[PDB]
Amino acid sequence: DIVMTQSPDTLSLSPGERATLSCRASQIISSNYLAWYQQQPGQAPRLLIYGASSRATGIPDRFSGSGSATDFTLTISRLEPEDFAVYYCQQYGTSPRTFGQGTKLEIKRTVAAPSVFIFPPSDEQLKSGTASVVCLLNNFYPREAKVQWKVDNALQSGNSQESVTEQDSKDSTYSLSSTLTLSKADYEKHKVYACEVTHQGLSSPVTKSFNRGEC
């Protein structure tokens, strides 16, 4: 079948700037049956463009599609924070109606250091035999951040997992949680639990900690 190749895979641009997205097809796409879609996190895809160049209803004018045979282009000219999305092209001349693999658009903002919070396991959880310790990095930019867990000063590895939010649609920041999982018994063997955070926006590492069972 037809293969649709998008480029770049990744784009990161400031508001006000212009984004130029490419779709190349492995066959001539007859008439101009090429569509573009926008997909925001946790949302269904939303149609931007059909007929290569015709804007779908309710779509702002700063989205414009061009191209003709194998080469196509989506131009987004005055980026807003809300434009963070994955953008897909789509051929609909022939079954299967093939999509490209997407260009992921991040929109830049100024550097922002995370606010860091640490949470001890609840007494309820402990009663069930495990302890989760949660470290929260809130509303930071850029996405890169480093979290290191210490238990009585010993560096942990392999017993934590991270999760990162998608870029926030209005302030363009990320948040991150790191969760340390121990057995109840292991948790009760140690006193000081600490989360050490490194980020471009912090001039030095931030440590948040507590002593097991104090407050």
Partner 1 sequence: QVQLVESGGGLVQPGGSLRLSCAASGFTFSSYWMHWVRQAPGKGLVWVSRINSDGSDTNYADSVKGRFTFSRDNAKNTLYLQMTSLRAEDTAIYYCTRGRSYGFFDYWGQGALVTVSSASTKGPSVFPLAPSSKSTSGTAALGCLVKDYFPEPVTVSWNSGALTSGVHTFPAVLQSSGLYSLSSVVTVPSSSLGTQTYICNVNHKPSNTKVDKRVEPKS
- Residue ranges that bind partner 1, judged by CB under 8 A: 33, 35, 37, 43-47, 50-51, 56-57, 88, 90, 92-93, 95-102, 115, 117-125, 128, 132, 134, 136, 138, 161-166, 175, 177, 179, 181, 208, 210, 215
Q: Give 50 or 107: the residue with its C-beta nearer to partner 1.
A: 50
* In the complex, minimum distance from the CB of residue 93 to partner 1, in angstroms, rounded to a whole number: 6
Whichever of 83 and 90 has its CB closer to partner 1, that residue is 90
CB 84, min distance to partner 1, A: 15
Q: Closest CB to partner 1 among 54 and 70? A: 54
Name residue 133's beta-bridge partners: 180
Please enumerate in sequence order all residues whose Cβ is within 8 A of that of 207, keeping only pairs 6 or more positions apart, or say none: 194, 195, 196, 197
CB-CB neighbours of 139 under 10 Å: 16
Q: In terms of CB distance, is 93 or 142 closer to partner 1?
A: 93
Give 195's DSSP letter.
E
User: What SS3 class is residue 81?
Assistant: helix
Closest CB to partner 1 among residues 19, 112: 112
Is there a contact between 72 and 50 (Cβ–Cβ < 8 Å)? Answer: no
Q: How far is the CB of 189 from partner 1 (least distance, A)?
A: 21
How far apart are CB 210 and partner 1 at their closest, in Å? Answer: 7
- Answer for the pair 162, 177: CB distance below 8 angstroms, yes or no: yes
**Which two structure tokens, joined as six digits, stand for 185?**
């018994």
63: left (phi over 0), alpha (psi -120 to 50) or beta: beta
Please report which residue ranges of the chain form alpha helices under DSSP H.
Answer: 123-126, 184-188
Q: Give me the least distance between CB of 56 and partner 1, in Å please.
A: 6
